Amino acid sequence: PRRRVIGQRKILPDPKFGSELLAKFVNILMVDGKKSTAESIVYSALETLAQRSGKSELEAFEVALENVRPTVEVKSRRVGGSTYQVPVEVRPVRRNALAMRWIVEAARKRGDKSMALRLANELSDAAENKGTAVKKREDVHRMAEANKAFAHY
Amino acid sequence: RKQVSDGVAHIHASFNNTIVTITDRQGNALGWATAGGSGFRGSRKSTPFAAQVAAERCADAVKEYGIKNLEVMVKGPGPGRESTIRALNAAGFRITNITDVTPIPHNGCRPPKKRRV
Amino acid sequence: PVIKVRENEPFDVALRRFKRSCEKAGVLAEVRRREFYEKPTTERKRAKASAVKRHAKKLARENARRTRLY
Amino acid sequence: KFCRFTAEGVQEIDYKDIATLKNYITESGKIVPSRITGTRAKYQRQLARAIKRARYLSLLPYTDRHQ
RNA sequence: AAAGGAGGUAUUCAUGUU
RNA sequence: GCUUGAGUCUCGUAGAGGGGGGUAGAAUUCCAGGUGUAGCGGUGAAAUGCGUAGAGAUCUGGAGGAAUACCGGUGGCGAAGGCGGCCCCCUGGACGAAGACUGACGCUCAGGUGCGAAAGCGUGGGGAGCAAACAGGAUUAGAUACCCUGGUAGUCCACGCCGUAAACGAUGUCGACUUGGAGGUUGUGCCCUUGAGGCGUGGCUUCCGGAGCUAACGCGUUAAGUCGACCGCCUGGGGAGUACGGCCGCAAGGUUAAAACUCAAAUGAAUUGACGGGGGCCCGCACAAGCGGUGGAGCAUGUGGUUUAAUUCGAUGCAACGCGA
């Protein structure tokens, strides 16, 4: 805005694992306000990922998210009359949300049948560093490298 | 091939393009590199980062001669004018002299006419 | 603007010193003004008018330094 | 301020006096502006003429350049 | 080169060293 | 007759004032050569152009022309145009101090004479850079331009001609008087220069401002203030600084300078708005960050159009089009 710094809203922790990260993940996954189905899908995918990857659902999820987190994004400044595509370091709060959004979109695209199965496969791919989400992040980093010439603008 | 372990870096930095040339203290040129050869074209070749990468490419080129000491002569009003120096320092020569050799006339020849854009 | 690296002098410090020396010399300003020939009339105008503009602001400060802001 | 020449009542600046001239030229060999140095305008002109003569006589260098 | 901030309407402000 | 106006002399002062002649360094260009290799150049982005016969870059040497960074200043000088490295020769003007001298020798000036930026012309040189014309590449709907790469006259010198400029302070020359302040510059007197200081007295110069004046804007001891001498010029806008004639000019053209006709305004300053591809300050799902749509498909509905005997009428940028209904 112009003249408004409104305080952040009250967000409830996840019931199962008490995770604010997981709560935002559920909200991002949710469509049309169907929170129940979204949370069921999240829980199913997390359980499957736990069993396959490691020991704890939260551990596997965190590992994947970190493997997808972006260091740098690009924005479009407009100073010299023309618009410069410049890289810029992304703040910690935005990192998690961007990673989760990318993961969710990739999960939606994938060809597996169940949504839970799609999410589990995408999370595992992210953990293995071969997923569509990490590919998207790496392409963003590649663009940042391309436009690194404007790193002091 | 003939190791001398000290060179002079002529950094001709115009507005459009930057040319870095490593030469012996006497004047015989050893190796050179430019943003054009670095691949940047136009608005990207007129940027400091291109100057830095051209400096690095030149440093690699003259690596055969094994020069260690390095005095720098920067000439011309170029966009980088400094990224070349930082690139050389990173490449790992001991920078001995930093000298400006911009040719300023004492009211000599008349410059070309002012642009109406 | 000749600079020779001092004994036990960091490279970043020397680089900053060199930029300072270039600034004090005014080399970029000189080349930037000398790139294109201004007409003698243009020079005389664009300088006298700017000088009078400076004088006016000096007067404005010296006068308006005797008023109640609030 | 503190015009040095009028403090001693100096009659004329001598181009043979290199030390003062070196104190009134910059490190590049350019003549220091009178507003900065605080000299009176008359002595400023005299000093400028003397410095130019010294430059011709190669007692002072023209510019901090190749030569 | 641009932006932010400070001082000045800016200068004598020992030299030395640097 | 007189000495107050005017002028002369004595001693100094500052000055890009003028003419002539030398010289210095930086820089650009070119040439020769060494090193070295594939780009250079240029733009908003490109191409023309240049480079393997070796460019651009870098070092050395040489040639040539033009101009004088810094100092540099709402600083100085000159009647105006104008004058800017340093040195010498010739030369003009201004100002200060103290005196001495001449004794109205003064001011202005139609015709006349001279000087008079830049472009231009004639003759002969010179030619680095820049650059009308011109050539090419772009841009664009077009681009006989702005942009880019080249590039001739010219720009420079000598001698002649031209003789105009927003040749402007848009303010003719000279003289007298009328409150102030802050500066700059250049003299000069005195006070202990109590050390860079303090108090005077001149000349030139910038800004602010009082009375007063002015249509207002503003000017304001450098008047556009109060007066005195002489001279030039104006008489509505266009037609028109044009025609004719005269004079000058190698020419380009310059100077002097109308008329018919036509309109009822043309203008100056200032005021309130609106606007600006002027400036600053602030806000709104205005943008940005997001989510979900529309524009693709089928159907509902409104409008346009077309058709019809009638397809009743109205709404039709936003602010009409599931509107009156």
Ligand SMILES: [Mg+2]
């Ligand atoms: Mg150019």
Ligand SMILES: [Mg+2]
């Ligand atoms: Mg001429």
Ligand SMILES: [Mg+2]
């Ligand atoms: Mg001629």
Ligand SMILES: [Mg+2]
């Ligand atoms: Mg000729």
Ligand SMILES: [Mg+2]
């Ligand atoms: Mg051109």
Ligand SMILES: [Mg+2]
């Ligand atoms: Mg006239």
Ligand SMILES: [Mg+2]
């Ligand atoms: Mg004028």
Ligand SMILES: [Mg+2]
């Ligand atoms: Mg007139």
Ligand SMILES: [Mg+2]
């Ligand atoms: Mg006034």
Ligand SMILES: [Mg+2]
């Ligand atoms: Mg005529």
Ligand SMILES: [Mg+2]
């Ligand atoms: Mg005429």
Ligand SMILES: [Mg+2]
């Ligand atoms: Mg005639």
Ligand SMILES: [Mg+2]
């Ligand atoms: Mg709102």
Ligand SMILES: [Mg+2]
């Ligand atoms: Mg948006």
Ligand SMILES: [Mg+2]
């Ligand atoms: Mg359609």
Ligand SMILES: [Mg+2]
């Ligand atoms: Mg549709």
